[PDB]
Structure 1
Amino acid sequence: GNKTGITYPEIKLGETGKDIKTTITFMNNRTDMNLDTYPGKNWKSYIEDFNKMYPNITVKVQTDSNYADSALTRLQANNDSWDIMMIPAVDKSEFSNYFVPYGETSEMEKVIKLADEKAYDGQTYGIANNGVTAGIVYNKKVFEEAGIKELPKTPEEFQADLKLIKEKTKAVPLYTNFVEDWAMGAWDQYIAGNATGDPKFMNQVLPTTKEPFKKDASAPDTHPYAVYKTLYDAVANGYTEEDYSTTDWESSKGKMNNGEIATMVLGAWAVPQMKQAGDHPDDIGYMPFPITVDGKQYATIAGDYSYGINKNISKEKQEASMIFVKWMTEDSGFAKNEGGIPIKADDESMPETYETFSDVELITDAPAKEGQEDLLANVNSDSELGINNGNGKKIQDIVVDAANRTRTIDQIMDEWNQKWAKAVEDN
């Protein structure tokens, strides 16, 4: 339900909704930005700048840790207790049950990037706050200490580099952040465009493939197998932290900035947070995930968290919400400040944390075929795997089985393949 009769492309900032006085509530996952100590530009600061062209629109910001679970709970209460949230892991088909359509994708495609990401039946329901790549954060000082001269481009190269970090430095070669279910489920984001160079892989190939997690016999250093085995080998070889069950995310940022951690597998949004986390921001870099496909590396551009607007609020509140979202996207500088690509479609400016991406082919997952937009979500749900769905529990299990030598990676992938295989057949 779009109760405002105006779409995002039609909003002209400064002279749409200038009459409005209301209070909107913004839920998001950036707890760090909801504090005055935040090293960068925090939420209060963005809003103050917003209230300089919409001084009558008050923005209250709520943030929760374990945001993935808290936003999903609120969403299912299906009330008007929130105006904007970052969209949690809901099937693309339910969007209309909870969110205002910003406009039709073909029209949104003229004013924002990734317009078809949070889209269903031709309407865009979410706008990425930032465009991010799936890569690895790395401490250049730790890499230098170990004598690493070329960034690793293959899983074998990466393991050999981790070994050198373990042997020659005091750093954790790869810090798992096991305790954060979202940091573990982050590994699902690398198995498609990065592992295959195939934009159709995530939404077409993967849900029509019965055993997608098996080793690729032709290109064994590629495809989902190679990604999950990277994490498995790093742990089983003893190149991750002493005790995965004691990892702490906030202090991991400080440790990494101080050179106590060499690498963390996290999207490009993590680069600024690592930089700001101590002195030595210039020790923090970002590298493509170490998979090469036919002699070229690939990195998918996808949205960070996408702004969704509560279908249940009044017309004035939807208007104010959409204005704020458009301001965040077009005026705030949030994307640039948080290390990412602006979603505004009159701007590209590949942020600075990307020189090591000079020869990487950046890609965006293609949409499913017509009538198959649901297919990946159906297989996912039937398989109980939760690929790219915050089911970080299956990733934690990789860590636990590698560390306790309970199963091989091929046994793990085999189990997953059998759950997946039945789900694909069933759809």
Structure 2
Amino acid sequence: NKTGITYPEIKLGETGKDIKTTITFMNNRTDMNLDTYPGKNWKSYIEDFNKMYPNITVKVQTDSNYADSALTRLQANNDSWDIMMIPAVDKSEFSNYFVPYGETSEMEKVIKLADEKAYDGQTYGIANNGVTAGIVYNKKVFEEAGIKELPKTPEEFQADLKLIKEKTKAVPLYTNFVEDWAMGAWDQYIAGNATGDPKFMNQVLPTTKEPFKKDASAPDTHPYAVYKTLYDAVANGYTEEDYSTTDWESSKGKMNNGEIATMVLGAWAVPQMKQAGDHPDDIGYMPFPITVDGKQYATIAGDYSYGINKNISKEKQEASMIFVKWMTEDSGFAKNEGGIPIKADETYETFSDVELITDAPAKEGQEDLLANVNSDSELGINNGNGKKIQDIVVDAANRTRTIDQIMDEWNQKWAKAVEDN
């Protein structure tokens, strides 16, 4: 764990000014690890970081398959890395792997989302950026299609997709099927966004046996409504022609240039689309098309969080925590990359009527319930089991199963796991 120098105590520019080492920072931003990156690349951020700390050297390592490779590395339990973006590992294991930045109580004072990546009152991960759950869209394609107001319900959304399919040349909704994480992203919409309830994720979901079934009183809400949105898009012919060959890098330029109308991704994705071509002002961001009793909701959550390897020397832990502190407070990464800065001190107009909510903690003694039901059901809700979402695309496309049948398969597995825990 930490060496007696806590994240709130770091005097930026003062502390650790005497250290001379190299630290290794693993992250998912392969694009930023190139000199071609359209915006501010890693070299630049570290160029600026060294203006203030010339003798802390930072080796940036990036992997396209980040979730699996970071987890494998994490499980190897060595000192081959100093910082990584934290992969899909249960919070109860953070103590095994990561250095605590400090008591959550105190991190709250200095950072947003202090209890997102935390256990037993200590905060082990700091979000690199706060991201809102919405949809990236091409405004020009929408006009071309004669869409006037943005869709707020699943039926409105499919009607708009159909307009795009019939009156434009753009793929209405591009799944990015081959990217496991892009499919896993649909789970970022099923709790706050689909229910308006900040307690859904950590309380209602893991105490509900069959949460994926159609909500009978409000059938256009709740997780079913999200997953059906994907199913219907694929099955009605509103997605790419060949899901098996989607290409994520290509799709940026394609949406910039009007060849794609929508992609269901978090707000981090907007500037990446904007810089992919000459048509940045054509990219917008809209709320996900669910309305709950007259209001729309969008969950704010962390993008990848920084984690510090607990196996490294006291000296390397410190320089790591300093580079985090700097990235957080002085780099300006989070804006530049299209989200909410995490240092604790007005977004798209399309969201001005959206209630922004964040998941609340479980009740006392139930903090580990979701992770345990998730593990036993093997559904991996909001982990990066993109696999079950890939399953939706495949079966909607080959028409072998209805969404009701898919959701019932998940419920049976979830319901066993709920009773078991």
Q: Which residue of 1 aligns with 2:187?
A: 188
Q: Which residue of 2 aligns with 1:362?
A: 356
Distance 2:74 2:328 in 1: 23
Contact (CA 8 Å) 1:158, 1:290: kept in 2 or not? Answer: yes
**Overall identity of the aligned pairs, in %:** 100
Contact (CA 8 Å) 2:2, 2:100: kept in 1 or not? Answer: no
Distance 1:250 1:230 in 2: 24
Contact (CA 8 Å) 2:2, 2:101: kept in 1 or not? Answer: no
Q: Deviations over 1:335-375 (max 9, x none)?
A: 01000000011xxxxxx752111010001000111121111
Q: Deviations over 1:101-155 (max 9, x none)?
A: 0000000000000000000000000000000011100000000100111010000
Distance 1:39 1:124 in 2: 33
Distance 2:89 2:2 in 1: 22
Query: What's the secondary structure of 1:27's corresponding residue?
Result: strand
Contact (CA 8 Å) 1:4, 1:316: kept in 2 or not? Answer: no
Deviates more, 1:13-22 or 1:352-361: 352-361
Distance 2:216 2:231 in 1: 19
Distance 2:206 2:348 in 1: 31
Contact (CA 8 Å) 2:209, 2:419: kept in 1 or not? Answer: yes
Query: What's the secondary structure of 1:39's corresponding residue?
Result: coil
Q: Deviations over 1:289-326 (max 9, x none)?
A: 00000100000000000000000000010000000000
Q: Deviations over 1:208-253 (max 9, x none)?
A: 0000000001111000000000000000010000000010000010
Query: What's the secondary structure of 1:292's corresponding residue?
Result: coil
Contact (CA 8 Å) 1:232, 1:398: kept in 2 or not? Answer: yes
* Pairwise CA distance, 1:4: 2.4
Q: What's the Cα RMSD here? A: 0.7
Distance 2:2 2:215 in 1: 50
- Name structure 1 gaps, 5 residues minimum: 346-351
Q: Deviations over 1:362-401 (max 9, x none)?
A: 0100011112111101000110111111100100110010
1:392-411 alignment to 2 at 5 Å?
A: 392-411=386-405
Distance 1:3 1:183 in 2: 34
Distance 1:198 1:90 in 2: 25
Contact (CA 8 Å) 1:185, 1:395: kept in 2 or not? Answer: yes
Q: Deviations over 1:73-117 (max 9, x none)?
A: 000000000000000011010000000000000000000000000
- How many residues get paired? 420
TM-score by length of structure 2 reads: 0.99
Moved over 6 A (4+): none
Q: Deviations over 1:15-36 (max 9, x none)?
A: 0111111100000000000000
Distance 1:137 1:208 in 2: 33
Q: Which residue of 2 aligns with 1:50?
A: 49
Contact (CA 8 Å) 1:33, 1:41: kept in 2 or not? Answer: yes
Contact (CA 8 Å) 1:100, 1:125: kept in 2 or not? Answer: yes
Query: What's the secondary structure of 2:52's corresponding residue?
Result: coil
